[PDB]
């Protein structure tokens, strides 16, 4: 009855939605532990370390539970709140972390290999020791945490390669991997994936909200929209373009980075619009919901633009509540049920909605798209990535 | 009298004595500066993002005044303290935040050039932008900072290079270089050089401290090392090796990552204690003084091996009063003034005191020393840097 238990953290300027693919990257190697030893994950509290990028409202020690169901979860592989792994071992002890990191030698092409090796720290480490010699450090933002132990581990391929080395030091109780966004998917479309991914169901009221709004000023139902839904996700296994969606556009803009980024695959505001504008005319679709982190004077600039833009905007106490990953899931499940949704390049909140669009059944075409920058040359789509059952 | 304000900040990782580096390679920019337009440095102030990393108890927002003689400062560049930017300015309002980075397109070999441009940020910016359009940060732990615009600026040479981008676009009354360790210093051991780290003299109190330490436990004063004090640190100049020092000898041991970072330029506990020994009855030294950030366990071991050691353990009050950098500065004081002295490979810590050391004016023959590794075979001493005053 004496478990493992696996934690991790991602490299600090990532954002949500990075964060939830390195999920999957954790859940692949979780599994393949599964296979030899009994593991559990452990869920890292969401918030972030720069307090700053979620202006007034302070986002910290956040539990999955107020973003996805735990039970869905659950059923794809064991995981439990990192406040129940404080309660289960004795207070919040971490025995071994591990930093991820590159191998300082590089490689030549045509040398690159799938590796582990406990190596050097290449960045000085950003854990120190206190006069207990416990090791403190950032724990999601829980500061009386502590580790035994740090070091680094220089790290290659896919997630699963970490697993042997675990394996074999079973010294460690508890193991957590921290910089988890150096390993990769172990496969990425593939039916094991997919088993993860899709366990990750919002929670019950942010699907809620959104399909309320979705009812009120979308002319949106399930029904309405040829979504019939299951609850259990093991369940729903669905024909691919069955679904129909609301009568509406989806689009993801994404202007954070478009300045500082010097970016040519993002489009102005007016050629944004040209673009949404051939597409209500392509599809019929008298109204279109946008998702986007657009500034009060550009919005305005798009709000005068396009009129029949519809958007969600969270009260203030709604967003002190649902917080920023709420928000964000709102907008993204809303997206997710529109006739036809078109994204911002390589932004991985495009990403998401894809996945979850691939989920419910609708059809590729109407799923993998992005905005062209204005003058972008040769403009490349996102890659259509489909379910395995 | 309407004049230019500088600010910068240096990659979180970087601990204590690398940012004093950092401030003369700032300091020298100023001096380029001021050949053209009224200029005034401000000091950003101590502490740190990543708050685990310090034993100071969430001790924040601390002045240069806790740690350094501010008009003795002053006399080297025009300088102020954040504070007092806040008052002269209007608010906390910074107009222009250049991120500092490296050339995304690296080099070849041989094509190496101090260069500056205005380039596409490379890591995600971490500052973010509110709801009135301004961009908020981690600014030295000020939440009320409010910068104006932000972008990256790819950047390689001395810290001069920057000077000219600066003075062309002459909008901008207040200027943020973040990232400022991309910077290199001008000329290291040059008069420039010299003047700005000459400049640079502990607290009163904190020397009072030393002294009071050294007078006690060290049997050890100026007069008595025949190491005469100057106030007026222009009108201290003294004859290379004039200075003899305290009847003991001082050492430095960094083992913070010591294995972590797999170490081979720094010596095992007993490889330490032998050479001491060694040392002290070579250079006839009765007493051991040895400032060291050695954690209980290790603490423990180096004490029986070394019984004879005298350190500065301060009390939970006094840690409280001279925070951080107020104990470290003691300890280096305090080692800077021993007649013979050993540090520890590429430590900062020890070149900050062989810096202190020149200024003194002891031997170089019993300033740069470091400790070998056990086994280390080339084991390069440190490189002797003369003042040229
Ligand atoms: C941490 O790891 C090292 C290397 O395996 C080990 O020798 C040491 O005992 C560990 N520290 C603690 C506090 O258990
Ligand atoms: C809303 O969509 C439904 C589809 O079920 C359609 O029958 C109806 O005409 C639409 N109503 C409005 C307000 O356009
Ligand atoms: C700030 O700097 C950027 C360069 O990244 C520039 O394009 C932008 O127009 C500037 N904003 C203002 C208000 O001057
Ligand atoms: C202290 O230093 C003096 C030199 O001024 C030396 O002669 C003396 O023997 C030392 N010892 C003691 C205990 O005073
Ligand atoms: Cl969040
Ligand atoms: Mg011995």
């Keep these: 009855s004496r478990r493992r238990y696996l934690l991790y953290d991602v490299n600090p300027p990532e954002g949500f939605n990075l964060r939830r693919d390195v999920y999957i990257r954790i859940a692949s190697l979780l599994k393949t ?6 593991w559990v994950l452990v869920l890292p509290p969401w918030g972030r370390l720069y307090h700053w990028q979620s202006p007034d409202i302070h986002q910290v020690r956040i539990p999955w539970s107020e973003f996805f169901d735990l039970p869905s979860l659950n059923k794809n592989i064991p995981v439990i709140e990192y406040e129940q792994f404080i309660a289960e071992s004795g207070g919040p002890f971490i025995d071994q972390v591990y930093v991820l990191q590159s191998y300082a030698e590089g490689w030549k092409e045509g040398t690159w290999e799938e590796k582990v090796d406990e190596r050097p720290c290449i960045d ?33 391929g ?17 193991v957590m991997l921290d910089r988890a966004e150096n ?3 172990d496969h990425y479309g593939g039916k094991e994936y997919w088993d993860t991914r899709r366990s990750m169901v919002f929670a019950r009221h942010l699907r809620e909200v959104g399909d309320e709004f979705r009812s009120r000023h979308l002319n949106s139902t399930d029904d309405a929209d040829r979504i019939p839904f299951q609850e259990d996700w093991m369940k729903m296994k669905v024909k691919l373009g069955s679904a129909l969606g609301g009568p509406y556009l989806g689009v993801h803009l994404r202007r954070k980075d ?6 040519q695959d993002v489009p102005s505001l007016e050629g944004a619009v040209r673009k949404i504008r051939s597409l209500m005319k392509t599809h019929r679709l008298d109204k279109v919901f946008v998702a986007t982190d657009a500034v009060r004077k550009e919005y305005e600039e798009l709000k005068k633009l396009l009129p029949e833009m519809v958007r969600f905007e969270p009260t203030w106490e709604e967003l002190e509540l649902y917080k920023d990953g709420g928000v964000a899931i709102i907008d993204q499940w809303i997206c997710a049920h529109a006739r036809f949704f078109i994204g911002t390049s390589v932004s991985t909140f495009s990403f998401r909605i894809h996945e979850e669009r691939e989920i419910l059944g609708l059809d590729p075409k109407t799923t993998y798209n992005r905005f062209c920058g204005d003058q972008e040359k040769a403009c490349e789509q996102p890659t259509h990535w489909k379910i395995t059952y």
């Excluded at 090791?135 to 500061?143: A, C, D, K, M, T």
């Excluded at 478009?258 to 970016?263: A, K, M, N, P, V």
């Design 258 to 263: 478009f300045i500082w980024g010097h970016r």
């Design 124 to 156: 000085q480490l950003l854990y120190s020791q206190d006069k207990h010699e416990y090791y403190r450090g950032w724990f999601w933002g829980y500061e009386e945490t502590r580790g035994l132990n740090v070091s680094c581990l220089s790290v290659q």
């Design 33 to 38: 532990l599964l296979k030899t030893e009994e």
């Design 158 to 174: 896919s997630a699963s390669i970490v697993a042997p080395l675990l394996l074999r030091n079973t010294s460690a109780r508890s």
């Design 183 to 185: 390993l990769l998917h």
